[PDB]
């Protein structure tokens, strides 16, 4: 009865995601296209309250619905898959790739040892594997996932449904670029759940794979803090260690959300923040405007 218990638990986990997606799916209508309207309409009264990003994500969900319906035509084939990674072809159109959780463990660790250990031992091992998968998957797909209608979740988090093997997920789809690692580590490769099947217990995610673009007429200057002596004491200038200059305009930057490489600063959005005029005047050259702080630690650059 392990599979039935697991199905019940997984349905309990998956139903809220399906309902959240249905809130936008049910209230998004594709009117007959013409020259007067070039897109689909969102039912604002039915949505009620939504941020701009959530509405744009609903639009993206609609645009996904076409290929989602194409994929769901192969629902019987999806259920029949018994391999970890499988490729589905029917008319050489939009070849569907299917990743199955724990299928490699079933094929390489339980079926080969079914002769060697008792049926109760194998059943307990299977139940343990499913429960560990639920314990690890809950951090990402549990109640922590409040807004499933969003393309802001990184593919590394999305891949927890596939044991966190996002490398297999990305290479299966065929993505390849010089900035693969730079896009990955900067949280720029994201995914969005576009379909949940409660009967077959599978989901369809849409991977958003962007390209890095150099921001023209912009650089990011770094300052190396060094303790300086004044009045028989050691001091450190309390100044932005990273300054963003774009079109010769000085602004602060939230580096913490960016990937710093030796050549450039890679960010998944514009993380520029304003700078007070006194800090800008000190960086401009009015050193009496930059504050300092006493150095009491034995170890400081």
């Amino acid at each position: 009865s392990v599979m039935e218990n697991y199905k019940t638990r997984l349905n309990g986990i998956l139903t809220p995601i399906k309902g959240a997606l249905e809130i936008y799916k049910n209230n998004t209508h594709d009117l007959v296209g013409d020259v007067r309207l070039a897109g689909v309409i969102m039912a604002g009264v039915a949505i009620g309250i939504a941020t701009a990003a959530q509405i744009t994500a609903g639009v993206a969900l609609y645009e996904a619905m076409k290929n989602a319906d194409n994929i769901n035509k192969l629902k019987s084939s999806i259920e029949s898959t018994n391999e970890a990674v499988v490729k589905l072809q029917e008319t050489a159109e939009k070849t569907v790739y299917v990743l199955t959780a724990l299928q490699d463990y079933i094929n390489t660790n339980l079926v080969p040892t079914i002769d060697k250990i008792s049926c109760k031992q194998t059943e307990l091992s299977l139940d343990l594997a499913l429960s560990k998968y639920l314990s690890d998957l809950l951090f990402v797909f549990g109640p922590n996932l409040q807004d499933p209608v969003s393309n802001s979740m990184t593919i590394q988090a999305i891949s927890q449904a596939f044991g966190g093997n996002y490398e297999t997920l990305l290479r299966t789809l065929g993505y390849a670029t010089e900035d693969f690692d730079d896009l990955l580590e900067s949280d720029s490769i994201t995914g969005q759940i576009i379909y949940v099947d409660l009967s077959s217990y599978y989901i369809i995610v849409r991977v958003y794979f962007p390209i890095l673009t150099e921001i023209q007429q912009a650089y990011i200057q770094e300052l190396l803090p060094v303790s300086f002596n004044n009045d028989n004491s050691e001091w450190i200038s309390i100044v932005p260690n990273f300054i963003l200059v774009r079109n010769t305009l000085i602004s602060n930057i939230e580096i913490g959300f960016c990937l710093i490489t030796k050549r450039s600063v890679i960010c998944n959005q514009d993380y520029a923040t304003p700078m007070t005029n006194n800090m800008r005047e000190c960086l401009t050259g009015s050193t009496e405007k930059c504050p300092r702080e006493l150095v009491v630690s034995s170890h400081v650059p």
Partner: antibody
Amino acid sequence: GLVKPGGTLTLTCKASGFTLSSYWMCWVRQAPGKGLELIACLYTNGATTWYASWVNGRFAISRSTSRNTVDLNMTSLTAADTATYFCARGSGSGWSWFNIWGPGTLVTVSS
Amino acid sequence: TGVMTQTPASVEAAVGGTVTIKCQASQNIISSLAWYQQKPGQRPKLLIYYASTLASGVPSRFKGSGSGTQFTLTISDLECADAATYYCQSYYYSGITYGNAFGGGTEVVVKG
């Protein structure tokens, strides 16, 4: 074996070579001179049940869980229900082939 | 639903020959097929499980084969005691897809 058209009957498993709760258990029926037909299985947890498409709630499985028995309940019986009803254990806890077949109980509907 | 098309209904073959029974599943069952032997007035006897694996104590002349939709059962070096009705059954259980059915049956009779 005696029963009246429209009556009810309750059968019991006669395997008795193991603990009944730990194994996959179907009820197989076979009309005289006809092929084997699967009626209904019962998971080891005891709540989830499998039913063929044709029963439609006419048959029901339960276990005594204390005397180590498994029962089958029948209602609205007809001449087609005349058969030998086999209690078949299925080799494992989950879905599987049967390696133990019960002796079976003859059932005859007739005025 | 799930159904099993088993051919042929009956068949004749002389002692020492080979007979081939075939079972067709409406849906893919992924090698989850069994084969049973039943003699009149007796309980069935398990012959083959998982389409290929022979049950313990079953002679090797019974050979099963197949995967997915099509499966075969071949009995070589036929004996008199082999005459019986032969059934197949699907016990498919992926976890989300349920496929369980019995074959119609094949009556084999050996020419002595």
